[PDB]
Amino acid sequence: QVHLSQSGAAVTKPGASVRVSCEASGYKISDHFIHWWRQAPGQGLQWVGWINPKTGQPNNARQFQGRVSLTRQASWDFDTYSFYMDLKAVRSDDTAIYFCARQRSDFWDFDVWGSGTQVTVSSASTKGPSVFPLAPTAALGCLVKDYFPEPVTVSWNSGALTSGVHTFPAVLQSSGLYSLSSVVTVPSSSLGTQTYICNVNHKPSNTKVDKRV
């Protein structure tokens, strides 16, 4: 069926160039324009540009004039097409989710979207997190601090504890690394009795700590 598969998350250094990809399949591709959109965290969508799949002709927003390149490579039988968005001279501003979307009609209704690619522009380089405890109905948690890049996963008692757990979304610091928190609530009684163990994994750096609280 009609589908747009995008490449996975990219990390980029300031001043460098990043390439996002979209693979179209499942329909008459020559007959519909592909657009790129993007979404900064806590922001609306902004249009980047479009590309004509027959001619290869692109057009983009003036904000990106001279630093974005939309290109196309078709398959032989035309059953599949790859679409690229190359962004060069990247800035802080360029950190966002980038979506590809298929234009259905001549009037810009977008009925099929790719899933999005995260593009993080950052000075830093891969780093495992430092996990510190949030010590004590009662609350307790783990502060998972200064890691890179995202993501990390947090469990309690190896997935054996799930109810009452809140794992917060990561925030970005003046440092340029990310910190989040995982908290869980428990009755004041169960602390002497029960063993509570934050269990963090940050596979891109191959870290996997278990912390008692």
Partner: protein, 198 residues
């Protein structure tokens, strides 16, 4: 060309209307946290295939309405309208539940982290509704007004509440000088601000 309001709360079974100021071939999209948009209505009022009939749009002269009948829990999302390259900022929609005061906690810095030169103090606002809350940091009655970040969970799909953490970050040095640390938070379900201290 704006959209109103910026946040809506509704009960299940209710009808909700979102209004767009825009002009042209106008399209409405639903977007779920962390996910791609989904076309609901195109061309002002045509309903996209596979979308439930409880969605409709009508052309209100210069402006356009989106309507959701018999609102449902899957309707919790952000809605926006688009005309060619132009997007209107959007409306968060969440489920209405009884007002619930925040459960507040404060965690001093671990001694383990101080060994690294940085001090983190955390406030936790647990399970409250509606989403709107404000946190402020007091220590020795000094009110800090830089050096703080805040993270908020999504409306919980079990009990319809929100949780919030504010992290105040310090050097090991400044942490030592002052001694007594406090979080103060204000919420609809609290008649007067509450503070936790260490």
């Amino acid at each position: 060309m704006t959209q109103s309001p910026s946040s809506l709360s509704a009960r299940v079974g209710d009808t909700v209307t979102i209004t767009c100021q825009a002009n042209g071939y106008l399209n409405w999209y639903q977007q779920r946290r962390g996910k791609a948009p989904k076309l609901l209505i195109y061309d002002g009022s045509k309903l996209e295939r596979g979308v439930p009939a409880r969605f409709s749009g009508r052309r209100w002269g210069q402006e356009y309405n989106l309507t959701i009948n018999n609102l449902q829990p899957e309707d919790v999302a952000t809605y926006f309208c688009q005309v060619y390259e132009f997007i209107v900022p959007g409306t968060r929609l969440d489920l209405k539940r009884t007002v619930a005061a925040p459960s507040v906690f404060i965690f001093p810095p671990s001694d383990e982290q101080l060994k690294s030169g940085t001090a983190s103090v955390v406030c936790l606002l647990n399970n409250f509704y509606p989403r709107e809350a404000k946190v402020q940091w007091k220590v020795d009655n000094a009110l800090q007004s830089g050096n703080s970040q805040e993270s908020v969970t999504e409306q919980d799909s079990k009990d319809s509440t929100y949780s919030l953490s504010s992290t105040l970050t310090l050097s090991k040095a400044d942490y030592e000088k002052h001694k007594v640390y406090a979080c103060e938070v204000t919420h609809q379900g609290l008649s007067s601000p509450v503070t936790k201290s260490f």
